[PDB]
Amino acid sequence: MIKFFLLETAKILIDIGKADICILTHVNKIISTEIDDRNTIELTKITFYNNSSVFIETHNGNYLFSGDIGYPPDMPDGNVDYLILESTQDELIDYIERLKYTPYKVFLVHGEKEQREILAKRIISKKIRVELPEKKVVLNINTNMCNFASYRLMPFSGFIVEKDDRIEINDKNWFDMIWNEEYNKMRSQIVAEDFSTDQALPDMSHDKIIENIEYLFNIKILSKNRIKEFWEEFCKGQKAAIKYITQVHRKNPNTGRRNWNPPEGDFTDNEIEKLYETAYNTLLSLIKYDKNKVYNILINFNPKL
């Protein structure tokens, strides 16, 4: 492509950095008339043509830089894909028209706005497209059109998002979706009385708590993750541990299951329910004690916490 001239494929400069410059009239190497007209050079076959023109045959596209035109010019007799033409009027026309295999897109350069616009309109009326010059790729994720003043237009206000590889264009549905996601993440960060004043509980002895916790640690009801989340919910207060054990012990009315891990053994249903309420009452009696006492209770089963 050509940047306003640097034409990569290399980075050959026609009249910046890492270039093979080809000066005009009217870096690593400078190519000019040595090679005369009618002779080809390699670098991408480069051939110069007299003006009174650089012709690069690449792998994709055959580029022609014209230079200033004053008199019959000299044009290639092969195949042209891009025609880079200066504009500062009928001389440029026939210079275009008298060339075989008329180019895909021409380029106007080195002039004011009015002359370039007049020549551009004259070339669209000849049915050749023009470009009038004055990076992450951009993706329209949009979806209605208009035709105001012979432009196809859409009234849209939106968001531009910038990632490491692309820039996307999104509407309000994306912003609503991410706002709902972040609102759900923000509201799931707090419970009303975490890490606050210490707050209707059964009471039981320390030795019975040791016996019950050891028995529900042998069979897999009170486990290491259960003691870990129990200690983490106990750190954020008493009511948080109350809410956590009520959530764990909650029997769903639709399925009849609780969040305890089932015991490893041959217990029948009534005994499994007795072990579940035993775990509930044992941990409820455990929330009564001081934090260091509960830490000394639970370090003997979960050494991490």
Partner 1 sequence: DMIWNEEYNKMRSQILPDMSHDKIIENIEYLFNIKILSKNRIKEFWEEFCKGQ
Partner 2 sequence: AKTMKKIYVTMKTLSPLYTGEVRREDKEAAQKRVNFPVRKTATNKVLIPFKGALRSALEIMLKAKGENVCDTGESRARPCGRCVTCSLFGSMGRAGRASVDFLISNDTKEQIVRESTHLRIERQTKSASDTFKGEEVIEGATFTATITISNPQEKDLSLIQSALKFIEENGIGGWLNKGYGRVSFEVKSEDVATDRFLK
Selection from a second copy, RNA, partner 2, none that 152 binds (CB < 5 to 8 A by kind) is: a second copy
Shortest spacing between CB 267 and partner 2, in angstroms: 13
Q: Which long-range contacts (CB under 8 A, 24 or more apart) does 68-73 make?
A: 68/24, 68/25, 68/26, 69/26, 69/95, 70/26
Task: Count residues near RNA (CB under 7 A).
Answer: 17
Selection from Zn ion, partner 1, RNA, none that 146 binds (CB < 5 to 8 A by kind) is: partner 1
Q: How many Å apart are CA 154 and CA 106, to the nearest integer?
A: 28
Asked whether position 4 contacts a second copy by CB under 8 A, the answer is no
- Residue from 4, 101, 104, 159 binding partner 1 (CB under 8 A): 159
Asked whether position 68 contacts Zn ion by CB under 5 A, the answer is yes
Selection from partner 1, RNA, Zn ion, none that 180 binds (CB < 5 to 8 A by kind) is: partner 1
**Greatest C-alpha distance within the chain:** 113
Q: How many Å apart are CA 275 and CA 268, to the nearest integer?
A: 11
Q: Which amino acid is at 271?
A: E
Q: How many Å apart are CA 107 and CA 83, to the nearest integer?
A: 6
H-helix or E-strand containing 29? Answer: strand 29-30
Q: How many Å apart are CA 15 and CA 67, to the nearest integer?
A: 9
The answer to whether 85 and 66 have CB atoms below 8 angstroms apart is yes
Asked whether position 249 contacts RNA by CB under 7 A, the answer is no
Other C-beta atoms lying within 10 Å of the C-beta of residue 69? 16
Closer residue to a second copy in complex, CB, 126/274? 126
Selection from partner 2, a second copy, Zn ion, none that 262 binds (CB < 5 to 8 A by kind) is: partner 2
Which residue is it, tokens 């028995």? 215
Residue numbers 170-199 binding a second copy by CB under 8 A? 175, 178-179, 181-182
Q: Which residues pair with 14 in a beta bridge?
A: 22
Asked whether position 250 contacts partner 1 by CB under 8 A, the answer is no
Asked whether position 91 contacts RNA by CB under 7 A, the answer is no
Q: How many Å apart are CA 131 and CA 152, to the nearest integer?
A: 18
45-48/54-57 β-pairing: antiparallel
| Site residues, partner 2 (CB under 8 A) | 18, 28-29, 220, 255, 257, 261-262, 264
Closer residue to Zn ion in complex, CB, 37/68? 68
Structure tokens at 105: 């897109």
Selection from a second copy, RNA, partner 2, none that 156 binds (CB < 5 to 8 A by kind) is: a second copy
Asked whether position 225 contacts RNA by CB under 7 A, the answer is yes
Give contact residues for a second copy (rule: CB under 8 A): 60-61, 79, 81-82, 99-102, 104, 127-129, 136-145, 148-149, 151-164, 167, 169, 175, 178-179, 181-182, 292
In the complex, the residues that contact partner 1 under the rule CB under 8 A are 146, 148, 153, 155, 157, 159, 172, 175-176, 179-180, 183
